[PDB]
Homo-oligomer: A and B are copies of this chain.
């Protein structure tokens, strides 16, 4: 029993992290086979970031200006290519610790583990969600660019995120592994606005089910509601609307606990309009939205991986 914000075991990712330097700048890279993936602004100085012309900047660099380091062994850059906002540094030796991997672009509301790195060396791992406004509220210091987010499907590692920038508002933006930014952000040091951030309603409902599984039952109310009335309340509190796809996803949770998805919504509606009044759920005074329905099933059933 019990519930925790669990991250994926990081060992398969640790062996893939390398240190990349172009000039003075040092950030992290992902060493898969004979290619190193890293943010393209490694070729920039602090001056270039205010208005970079990446095409012109990269042309002044050559394969010899890139120093990719893995521990105390140095890799030789045999070729470089720019794919969107990511740089593909081809080297001569394939990574012996290359795992079965996949590149995926996740949707807002999905969760993943971030392996925070500095100078190519792991420092810690934590679980987070992609906000509906395509940002992440992580912990990134200077030099942590190039740290990757990932999920683990048993034996296959699914890389979904590479960190690029901290916005002036202190939130973090990045790309998929093809270099396409999540959200309307560009890799340039200018004021960039993220959208209004909403609460991931389907995630909150799955967390309420986890509370029921682990003994927290006081919020189970005496009312019910419909999928049109609840969304009316949800919109007022900046909650994202619930669809029938979300109801279908919560099905196994409803079957395991005996509480209908619509019934749990009425419980949440009362929580929204009347607060929690000094009481906690699973040790929290706030409604939690960084657990997906799949995360709850994984932790409550104890699925393992390679």
Q: Which residues of A contact B (CB under 8 A)?
A: 1-12, 14-15, 115-119, 121-126, 128, 137-141, 143-144, 166, 170-172, 214-215, 280, 283-286, 298-306
Contacts and interface: CB of A to CB of B under 8 A. Distances in A.
Contacts of A166: 1
Given A118-B302, A304-B118, A124 B11 contact: no
A4 B285 contact: no
B4 A139 contact: yes
A126 B170 contact: no
Contacts of A3: 139
B5 A115 contact: no
Interface centre among A125, A300, A301, A306 (most CB of B within 10 A): A125
B141 A302 contact: yes
Contacts of A4: 126, 128, 138-139
Contacts of A2: 137-140, 170-172
Given A121-B304, A166-B1, A283 B137 contact: yes
Contact of A126 (B7, B12, B302): B7
Contact of A124 (B6, B122, B140): B6
- Interface of A, secondary structure class, is loop
A146 to B, nearest CB: 14
Nearest to A117: B304
Interface centre among A7, A118, A298 (most CB of B within 10 A): A7
A205 B48 CA distance: 40
15 contacts: A1-B166, A2-B171, A2-B172, A5-B5, A6-B116, A6-B139, A7-B126, A11-B11, A11-B12, A121-B304, A123-B302, A125-B125, A139-B299, A284-B286, A285-B285
Nearest to A8: B124
Contacts of A137: 2, 283
The 3 A-B pairs at the shortest CB distance, nearest first, are namely A11-B11, A6-B124, A285-B285
Contacts of A118: 302, 304
A303 B144 CA distance: 11
A194 to B, nearest CB: 14
Nearest to A17: B9
Given A7-B124, A118-B304, 11 more contacts: A1-B166, A2-B138, A6-B123, A7-B7, A9-B11, A9-B124, A119-B304, A123-B298, A125-B125, A143-B302, A144-B302
